Amino acid sequence: PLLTDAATVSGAERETAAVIFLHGLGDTGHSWADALSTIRLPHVKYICPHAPRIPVTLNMKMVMPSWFDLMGLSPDAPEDEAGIKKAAENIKALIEHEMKNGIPANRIVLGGFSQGGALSLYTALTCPHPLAGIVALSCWLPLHRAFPQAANGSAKDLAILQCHGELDPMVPVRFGALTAEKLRSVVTPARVQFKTYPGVMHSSCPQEMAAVKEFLEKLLPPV
Ligand SMILES: COc1ccc(N2CCN(C(=O)c3cc4c(s3)-c3ccccc3S(=O)(=O)C4)CC2)cc1
């Protein structure tokens, strides 16, 4: 029984493509739905699911919206393997639902910000269906030591746009750079675009939103 709580930007024309975008820790999908609507394509649907509220270890076990538990801020810190995989399964059900209802997998893009971006990278790289690509913003690859081995054979065709703010204090830009190297270990280095933005911190920016629009226009053309 699939029950999805989300803010969805509908296409003005019949939808022939889907973007599933995952917000960052503590948020809802509302703000990112509004942001993606400002750059929307007429035949593209943008699904922004709301993360479930769980206790987060790093925040004194406080209950808040989170895709999985968080324990440390360094690349060697323990990660919530069971939580990351369960959340990836819930996203993979959303992918299969869109597929069951007439949207080809090579017309589905996964994406997200920070924690949500991190889940979208894990899920797309391990998805058994060949997806169009990923829009990974200010994030990292969860369970990075399992890659490239852990990636599905279907990950070869992915097109990746990875963005980062150069002055990000939450997810240092070097962690984004290390993640991009790991992504080029699965996808051809030419199909991974790593864009960094000077003077940008842990946020989006109009140049990043423009890059996302340009990437999706080329990746998801009409019909
Ligand atoms: C292949 O290269 C890499 C490079 C680095 C890593 N790391 C990144 C750090 N990390 C984390 O678990 C967290 C990241 C964030 C956490 S906790 C957080 C905590 C409190 C508030 C907000 C947040 S946050 O904004 O979501 C960012 C372990 C893995 C993996 C692979």
Side-chain angles (χ1 to χ4, degrees), residues 104-153 155 157-162:
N106 75 345
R107 294 286 288 183
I108 300 174
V109 165
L110 261 43
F113 183 79
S114 195
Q115 192 199 45
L119 185 56
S120 287
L121 285 174
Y122 186 82
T123 306
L125 289 182
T126 61
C127 175
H129 309 108
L131 294 170
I134 327 169
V135 172
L137 311 181
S138 308
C139 59
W140 73 94
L141 175 61
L143 314 172
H144 74 275
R145 284 174 195 104
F147 292 91
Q149 296 70 33
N152 194 280
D157 307 276
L158 287 162
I160 304 173
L161 175 64
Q162 188 189 352

Short mmCIF file of all heavy atoms in Angstrom, two decimals, residues 104-162, unseen atoms left out:
data_model
loop_
_atom_site.label_atom_id
_atom_site.label_comp_id
_atom_site.label_asym_id
_atom_site.label_seq_id
_atom_site.Cartn_x
_atom_site.Cartn_y
_atom_site.Cartn_z
N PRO A 104 8.05 6.77 -18.71
CA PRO A 104 9.22 5.87 -18.83
C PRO A 104 10.29 6.18 -17.78
O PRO A 104 10.44 7.35 -17.41
CB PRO A 104 9.74 6.15 -20.24
CG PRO A 104 8.71 6.90 -20.92
CD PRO A 104 7.89 7.61 -19.91
N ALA A 105 11.02 5.17 -17.31
CA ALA A 105 12.07 5.44 -16.34
C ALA A 105 13.08 6.43 -16.92
O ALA A 105 13.54 7.27 -16.17
CB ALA A 105 12.77 4.14 -15.90
N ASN A 106 13.43 6.36 -18.25
CA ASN A 106 14.44 7.30 -18.80
C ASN A 106 13.86 8.72 -18.99
O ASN A 106 14.52 9.57 -19.59
CB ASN A 106 15.10 6.78 -20.10
CG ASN A 106 14.25 6.86 -21.37
OD1 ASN A 106 13.03 7.04 -21.30
ND2 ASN A 106 14.86 6.75 -22.56
N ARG A 107 12.66 8.98 -18.41
CA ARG A 107 12.01 10.29 -18.36
C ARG A 107 11.80 10.73 -16.88
O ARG A 107 11.06 11.68 -16.64
CB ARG A 107 10.68 10.29 -19.14
CG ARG A 107 10.86 10.09 -20.63
CD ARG A 107 11.42 11.31 -21.34
NE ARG A 107 10.42 12.38 -21.44
CZ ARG A 107 10.61 13.55 -22.05
NH1 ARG A 107 11.77 13.82 -22.64
NH2 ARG A 107 9.64 14.45 -22.07
N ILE A 108 12.47 10.04 -15.91
CA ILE A 108 12.38 10.30 -14.47
C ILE A 108 13.74 10.80 -13.98
O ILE A 108 14.77 10.13 -14.18
CB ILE A 108 11.90 9.05 -13.66
CG1 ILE A 108 10.51 8.58 -14.15
CG2 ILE A 108 11.92 9.31 -12.14
CD1 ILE A 108 9.94 7.23 -13.53
N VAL A 109 13.75 11.95 -13.31
CA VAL A 109 14.98 12.52 -12.72
C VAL A 109 14.79 12.53 -11.23
O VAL A 109 13.68 12.82 -10.76
CB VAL A 109 15.27 13.96 -13.28
CG1 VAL A 109 16.30 14.73 -12.44
CG2 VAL A 109 15.69 13.92 -14.75
N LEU A 110 15.83 12.10 -10.47
CA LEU A 110 15.78 12.19 -9.01
C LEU A 110 16.58 13.42 -8.59
O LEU A 110 17.45 13.86 -9.34
CB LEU A 110 16.37 10.92 -8.37
CG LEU A 110 15.38 9.88 -7.88
CD1 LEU A 110 14.23 9.63 -8.85
CD2 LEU A 110 16.09 8.61 -7.44
N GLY A 111 16.25 14.03 -7.48
CA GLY A 111 17.04 15.18 -7.05
C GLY A 111 16.83 15.54 -5.60
O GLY A 111 15.97 14.99 -4.91
N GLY A 112 17.62 16.48 -5.12
CA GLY A 112 17.44 16.90 -3.75
C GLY A 112 18.46 17.91 -3.28
O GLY A 112 19.43 18.23 -3.97
N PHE A 113 18.23 18.37 -2.07
CA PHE A 113 19.10 19.33 -1.38
C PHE A 113 19.65 18.66 -0.15
O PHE A 113 18.86 18.12 0.64
CB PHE A 113 18.31 20.59 -0.98
CG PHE A 113 19.20 21.62 -0.31
CD1 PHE A 113 20.03 22.44 -1.07
CD2 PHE A 113 19.27 21.71 1.07
CE1 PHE A 113 20.89 23.35 -0.46
CE2 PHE A 113 20.13 22.62 1.69
CZ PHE A 113 20.92 23.45 0.92
N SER A 114 20.98 18.79 0.07
CA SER A 114 21.68 18.28 1.26
C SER A 114 21.27 16.84 1.58
O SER A 114 21.46 15.97 0.72
CB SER A 114 21.48 19.23 2.43
OG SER A 114 22.40 18.97 3.47
N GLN A 115 20.62 16.58 2.74
CA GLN A 115 20.23 15.22 3.07
C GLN A 115 19.36 14.58 1.95
O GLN A 115 19.52 13.40 1.65
CB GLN A 115 19.51 15.17 4.43
CG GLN A 115 19.33 13.76 4.95
CD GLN A 115 18.27 13.72 6.01
OE1 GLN A 115 17.20 14.31 5.86
NE2 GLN A 115 18.56 12.99 7.08
N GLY A 116 18.42 15.35 1.37
CA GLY A 116 17.55 14.86 0.30
C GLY A 116 18.32 14.55 -0.97
O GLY A 116 18.08 13.53 -1.63
N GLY A 117 19.28 15.42 -1.29
CA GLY A 117 20.19 15.21 -2.43
C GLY A 117 20.99 13.94 -2.22
O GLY A 117 21.17 13.14 -3.16
N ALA A 118 21.45 13.73 -0.97
CA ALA A 118 22.23 12.56 -0.60
C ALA A 118 21.39 11.28 -0.82
O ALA A 118 21.89 10.31 -1.42
CB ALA A 118 22.65 12.69 0.86
N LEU A 119 20.10 11.28 -0.42
CA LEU A 119 19.24 10.13 -0.66
C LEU A 119 19.00 9.92 -2.15
O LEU A 119 18.94 8.76 -2.58
CB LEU A 119 17.86 10.31 0.05
CG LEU A 119 16.87 9.13 0.00
CD1 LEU A 119 17.49 7.83 0.55
CD2 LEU A 119 15.63 9.47 0.79
N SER A 120 18.83 11.02 -2.93
CA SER A 120 18.58 10.88 -4.37
C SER A 120 19.79 10.26 -5.09
O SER A 120 19.60 9.49 -6.03
CB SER A 120 18.19 12.21 -4.99
OG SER A 120 16.87 12.54 -4.59
N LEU A 121 21.04 10.57 -4.64
CA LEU A 121 22.24 9.96 -5.27
C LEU A 121 22.28 8.44 -5.01
O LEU A 121 22.44 7.67 -5.95
CB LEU A 121 23.54 10.60 -4.72
CG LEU A 121 23.93 12.03 -5.20
CD1 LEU A 121 25.16 12.55 -4.44
CD2 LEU A 121 24.28 12.05 -6.66
N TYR A 122 22.08 8.01 -3.73
CA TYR A 122 22.08 6.59 -3.37
C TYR A 122 21.01 5.83 -4.14
O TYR A 122 21.31 4.80 -4.75
CB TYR A 122 21.89 6.38 -1.86
CG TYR A 122 22.03 4.92 -1.46
CD1 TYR A 122 23.29 4.36 -1.27
CD2 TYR A 122 20.92 4.12 -1.26
CE1 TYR A 122 23.43 3.01 -0.97
CE2 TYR A 122 21.05 2.77 -0.95
CZ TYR A 122 22.31 2.22 -0.78
OH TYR A 122 22.48 0.90 -0.42
N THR A 123 19.77 6.35 -4.11
CA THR A 123 18.61 5.71 -4.76
C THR A 123 18.82 5.61 -6.29
O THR A 123 18.64 4.53 -6.83
CB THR A 123 17.33 6.50 -4.45
OG1 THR A 123 17.17 6.68 -3.05
CG2 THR A 123 16.08 5.84 -5.02
N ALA A 124 19.22 6.69 -6.98
CA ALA A 124 19.38 6.59 -8.44
C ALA A 124 20.51 5.63 -8.83
O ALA A 124 20.34 4.83 -9.75
CB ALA A 124 19.63 7.96 -9.04
N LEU A 125 21.64 5.67 -8.12
CA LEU A 125 22.78 4.79 -8.42
C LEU A 125 22.48 3.31 -8.19
O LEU A 125 23.16 2.47 -8.77
CB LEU A 125 23.99 5.19 -7.57
CG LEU A 125 24.68 6.48 -7.93
CD1 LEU A 125 25.87 6.68 -7.03
CD2 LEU A 125 25.13 6.50 -9.39
N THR A 126 21.51 2.99 -7.32
CA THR A 126 21.17 1.59 -6.99
C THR A 126 19.82 1.15 -7.57
O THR A 126 19.34 0.04 -7.26
CB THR A 126 21.14 1.40 -5.46
OG1 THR A 126 20.14 2.26 -4.90
CG2 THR A 126 22.50 1.65 -4.81
N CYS A 127 19.20 2.01 -8.37
CA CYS A 127 17.89 1.76 -8.95
C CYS A 127 18.03 0.77 -10.10
O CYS A 127 18.93 0.95 -10.94
CB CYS A 127 17.23 3.07 -9.42
SG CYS A 127 15.64 2.85 -10.29
N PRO A 128 17.16 -0.28 -10.13
CA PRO A 128 17.29 -1.31 -11.17
C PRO A 128 16.76 -0.89 -12.54
O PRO A 128 16.90 -1.66 -13.50
CB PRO A 128 16.47 -2.49 -10.62
CG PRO A 128 15.46 -1.87 -9.73
CD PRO A 128 16.09 -0.61 -9.17
N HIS A 129 16.16 0.31 -12.62
CA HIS A 129 15.61 0.87 -13.86
C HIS A 129 16.50 2.02 -14.35
O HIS A 129 16.98 2.79 -13.51
CB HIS A 129 14.17 1.36 -13.64
CG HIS A 129 13.30 0.32 -13.00
ND1 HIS A 129 12.89 0.45 -11.68
CD2 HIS A 129 12.82 -0.83 -13.51
CE1 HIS A 129 12.17 -0.63 -11.43
NE2 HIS A 129 12.09 -1.43 -12.50
N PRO A 130 16.74 2.16 -15.68
CA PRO A 130 17.64 3.21 -16.14
C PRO A 130 16.94 4.55 -16.13
O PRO A 130 16.04 4.77 -16.94
CB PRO A 130 18.08 2.76 -17.55
CG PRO A 130 17.23 1.60 -17.90
CD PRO A 130 16.25 1.34 -16.80
N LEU A 131 17.29 5.38 -15.15
CA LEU A 131 16.70 6.70 -14.92
C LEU A 131 17.32 7.73 -15.85
O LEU A 131 18.39 7.47 -16.41
CB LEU A 131 16.88 7.12 -13.43
CG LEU A 131 16.12 6.27 -12.38
CD1 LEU A 131 16.58 6.60 -10.97
CD2 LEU A 131 14.60 6.53 -12.46
N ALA A 132 16.66 8.91 -16.00
CA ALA A 132 17.23 9.94 -16.87
C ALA A 132 18.45 10.54 -16.24
O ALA A 132 19.45 10.72 -16.92
CB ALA A 132 16.22 11.03 -17.16
N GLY A 133 18.36 10.84 -14.94
CA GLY A 133 19.47 11.49 -14.27
C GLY A 133 19.20 11.91 -12.85
O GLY A 133 18.20 11.50 -12.24
N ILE A 134 20.11 12.76 -12.33
CA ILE A 134 20.04 13.25 -10.95
C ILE A 134 20.43 14.73 -10.88
O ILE A 134 21.36 15.12 -11.57
CB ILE A 134 20.98 12.45 -9.97
CG1 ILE A 134 21.14 10.95 -10.32
CG2 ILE A 134 20.58 12.69 -8.49
CD1 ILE A 134 22.19 10.27 -9.59
N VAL A 135 19.76 15.52 -10.03
CA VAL A 135 20.04 16.93 -9.73
C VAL A 135 20.39 16.93 -8.23
O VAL A 135 19.50 16.94 -7.36
CB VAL A 135 18.85 17.86 -10.08
CG1 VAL A 135 19.09 19.29 -9.59
CG2 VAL A 135 18.58 17.86 -11.58
N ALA A 136 21.70 16.90 -7.94
CA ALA A 136 22.20 16.72 -6.59
C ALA A 136 22.76 18.03 -6.07
O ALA A 136 23.79 18.48 -6.57
CB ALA A 136 23.29 15.63 -6.63
N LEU A 137 22.07 18.67 -5.12
CA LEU A 137 22.45 20.00 -4.64
C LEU A 137 23.02 20.01 -3.25
O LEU A 137 22.39 19.51 -2.32
CB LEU A 137 21.25 20.99 -4.72
CG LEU A 137 20.45 21.06 -6.05
CD1 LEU A 137 19.35 22.08 -5.93
CD2 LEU A 137 21.35 21.50 -7.22
N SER A 138 24.22 20.61 -3.10
CA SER A 138 24.90 20.74 -1.81
C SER A 138 24.81 19.45 -0.98
O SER A 138 24.26 19.47 0.14
CB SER A 138 24.27 21.90 -1.05
OG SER A 138 24.24 23.07 -1.85
N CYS A 139 25.34 18.32 -1.52
CA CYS A 139 25.17 17.06 -0.80
C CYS A 139 26.41 16.16 -0.86
O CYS A 139 27.52 16.60 -1.25
CB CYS A 139 23.92 16.33 -1.27
SG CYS A 139 23.91 15.94 -3.04
N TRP A 140 26.21 14.90 -0.46
CA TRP A 140 27.24 13.88 -0.40
C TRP A 140 26.65 12.55 -0.77
O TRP A 140 25.42 12.40 -0.73
CB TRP A 140 27.82 13.83 1.02
CG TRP A 140 26.87 13.21 2.03
CD1 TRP A 140 26.84 11.90 2.42
CD2 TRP A 140 25.77 13.85 2.70
NE1 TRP A 140 25.86 11.72 3.38
CE2 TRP A 140 25.14 12.87 3.50
CE3 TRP A 140 25.26 15.16 2.70
CZ2 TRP A 140 24.08 13.19 4.37
CZ3 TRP A 140 24.16 15.45 3.50
CH2 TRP A 140 23.57 14.47 4.32
N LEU A 141 27.51 11.57 -1.10
CA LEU A 141 27.06 10.23 -1.40
C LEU A 141 27.00 9.40 -0.12
O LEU A 141 28.07 9.10 0.44
CB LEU A 141 28.01 9.57 -2.43
CG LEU A 141 27.73 8.08 -2.76
CD1 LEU A 141 26.36 7.92 -3.37
CD2 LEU A 141 28.77 7.54 -3.73
N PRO A 142 25.79 8.97 0.34
CA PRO A 142 25.73 8.06 1.50
C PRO A 142 26.36 6.72 1.17
O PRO A 142 26.32 6.29 0.00
CB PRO A 142 24.23 7.88 1.73
CG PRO A 142 23.56 8.96 0.98
CD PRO A 142 24.45 9.21 -0.21
N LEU A 143 26.94 6.06 2.19
CA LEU A 143 27.56 4.73 2.09
C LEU A 143 28.58 4.70 0.93
O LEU A 143 28.68 3.71 0.20
CB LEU A 143 26.47 3.62 1.92
CG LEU A 143 25.23 3.68 2.86
CD1 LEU A 143 24.16 2.66 2.47
CD2 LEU A 143 25.62 3.47 4.31
N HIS A 144 29.39 5.78 0.82
CA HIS A 144 30.33 6.02 -0.28
C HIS A 144 31.36 4.90 -0.46
O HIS A 144 31.76 4.62 -1.61
CB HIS A 144 31.03 7.37 -0.11
CG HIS A 144 32.10 7.43 0.95
ND1 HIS A 144 31.78 7.68 2.28
CD2 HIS A 144 33.44 7.40 0.82
CE1 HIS A 144 32.94 7.73 2.92
NE2 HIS A 144 33.97 7.60 2.07
N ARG A 145 31.74 4.22 0.64
CA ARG A 145 32.74 3.12 0.57
C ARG A 145 32.22 1.88 -0.18
O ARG A 145 33.02 1.06 -0.65
CB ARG A 145 33.19 2.73 1.98
CG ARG A 145 34.15 3.76 2.52
CD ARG A 145 34.57 3.56 3.96
NE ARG A 145 35.19 4.80 4.41
CZ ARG A 145 34.60 5.68 5.21
NH1 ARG A 145 33.41 5.42 5.73
NH2 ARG A 145 35.21 6.82 5.51
N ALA A 146 30.89 1.74 -0.31
CA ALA A 146 30.26 0.62 -1.02
C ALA A 146 30.31 0.83 -2.56
O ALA A 146 30.10 -0.11 -3.34
CB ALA A 146 28.83 0.47 -0.55
N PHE A 147 30.64 2.06 -2.99
CA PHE A 147 30.66 2.44 -4.39
C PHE A 147 32.10 2.42 -4.95
O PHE A 147 33.05 2.57 -4.18
CB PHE A 147 29.98 3.81 -4.57
CG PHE A 147 28.50 3.72 -4.29
CD1 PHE A 147 28.00 3.94 -3.01
CD2 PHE A 147 27.60 3.33 -5.29
CE1 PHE A 147 26.63 3.80 -2.74
CE2 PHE A 147 26.23 3.22 -5.02
CZ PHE A 147 25.76 3.45 -3.75
N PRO A 148 32.31 2.16 -6.26
CA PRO A 148 31.29 1.98 -7.33
C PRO A 148 30.60 0.60 -7.35
O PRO A 148 29.58 0.46 -8.02
CB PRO A 148 32.09 2.22 -8.62
CG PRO A 148 33.50 1.83 -8.29
CD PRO A 148 33.68 2.12 -6.81
N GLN A 149 31.14 -0.41 -6.62
CA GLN A 149 30.63 -1.80 -6.60
C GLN A 149 29.12 -1.91 -6.39
O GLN A 149 28.45 -2.63 -7.14
CB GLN A 149 31.34 -2.65 -5.53
CG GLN A 149 32.85 -2.86 -5.73
CD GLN A 149 33.68 -1.61 -5.50
OE1 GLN A 149 33.37 -0.74 -4.67
NE2 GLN A 149 34.75 -1.47 -6.28
N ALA A 150 28.59 -1.18 -5.40
CA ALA A 150 27.16 -1.17 -5.01
C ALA A 150 26.22 -0.60 -6.08
O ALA A 150 25.00 -0.82 -5.99
CB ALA A 150 26.99 -0.37 -3.73
N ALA A 151 26.73 0.17 -7.05
CA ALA A 151 25.86 0.77 -8.06
C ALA A 151 25.29 -0.29 -9.02
O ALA A 151 25.96 -1.28 -9.34
CB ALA A 151 26.57 1.86 -8.84
N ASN A 152 24.04 -0.09 -9.46
CA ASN A 152 23.40 -1.03 -10.36
C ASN A 152 23.98 -0.85 -11.77
O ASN A 152 24.48 0.23 -12.09
CB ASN A 152 21.87 -0.84 -10.33
CG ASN A 152 21.10 -1.96 -10.97
OD1 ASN A 152 20.97 -2.03 -12.20
ND2 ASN A 152 20.56 -2.85 -10.16
N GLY A 153 23.92 -1.90 -12.58
CA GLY A 153 24.36 -1.85 -13.97
C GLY A 153 23.65 -0.75 -14.75
O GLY A 153 24.24 -0.13 -15.62
N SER A 154 22.39 -0.44 -14.36
CA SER A 154 21.52 0.57 -15.00
C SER A 154 21.95 2.02 -14.73
O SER A 154 21.36 2.96 -15.31
CB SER A 154 20.07 0.38 -14.55
N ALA A 155 22.93 2.22 -13.84
CA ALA A 155 23.44 3.54 -13.48
C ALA A 155 24.36 4.16 -14.54
O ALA A 155 24.62 5.37 -14.48
CB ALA A 155 24.17 3.45 -12.15
N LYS A 156 24.85 3.35 -15.50
CA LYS A 156 25.77 3.76 -16.57
C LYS A 156 25.26 4.94 -17.44
O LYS A 156 26.04 5.80 -17.85
CB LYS A 156 26.06 2.56 -17.49
N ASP A 157 23.96 4.95 -17.74
CA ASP A 157 23.31 5.91 -18.63
C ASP A 157 22.93 7.22 -17.92
O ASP A 157 22.52 8.17 -18.59
CB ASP A 157 22.06 5.26 -19.25
CG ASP A 157 22.36 3.93 -19.90
OD1 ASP A 157 22.79 3.92 -21.08
OD2 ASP A 157 22.23 2.88 -19.21
N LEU A 158 23.08 7.28 -16.60
CA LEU A 158 22.64 8.50 -15.86
C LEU A 158 23.36 9.78 -16.29
O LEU A 158 24.56 9.77 -16.55
CB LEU A 158 22.88 8.32 -14.35
CG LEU A 158 21.97 7.37 -13.56
CD1 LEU A 158 22.59 6.97 -12.24
CD2 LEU A 158 20.63 8.01 -13.26
N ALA A 159 22.63 10.90 -16.31
CA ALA A 159 23.22 12.23 -16.53
C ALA A 159 23.15 12.94 -15.18
O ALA A 159 22.10 12.92 -14.53
CB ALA A 159 22.47 12.99 -17.62
N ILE A 160 24.28 13.45 -14.69
CA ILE A 160 24.27 14.04 -13.36
C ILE A 160 24.68 15.51 -13.35
O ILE A 160 25.75 15.87 -13.85
CB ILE A 160 25.17 13.23 -12.37
CG1 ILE A 160 24.75 11.74 -12.31
CG2 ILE A 160 25.14 13.84 -10.97
CD1 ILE A 160 25.70 10.86 -11.49
N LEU A 161 23.85 16.33 -12.69
CA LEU A 161 24.15 17.71 -12.38
C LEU A 161 24.34 17.78 -10.90
O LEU A 161 23.37 17.59 -10.15
CB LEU A 161 23.04 18.70 -12.83
CG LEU A 161 23.28 20.17 -12.38
CD1 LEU A 161 24.53 20.79 -13.01
CD2 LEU A 161 22.06 21.01 -12.64
N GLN A 162 25.56 18.06 -10.47
CA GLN A 162 25.83 18.21 -9.04
C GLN A 162 26.30 19.63 -8.78
O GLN A 162 27.27 20.06 -9.39
CB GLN A 162 26.84 17.18 -8.54
CG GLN A 162 26.99 17.21 -7.01
CD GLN A 162 28.14 16.35 -6.50
OE1 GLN A 162 28.78 15.59 -7.24
NE2 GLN A 162 28.46 16.48 -5.21
#
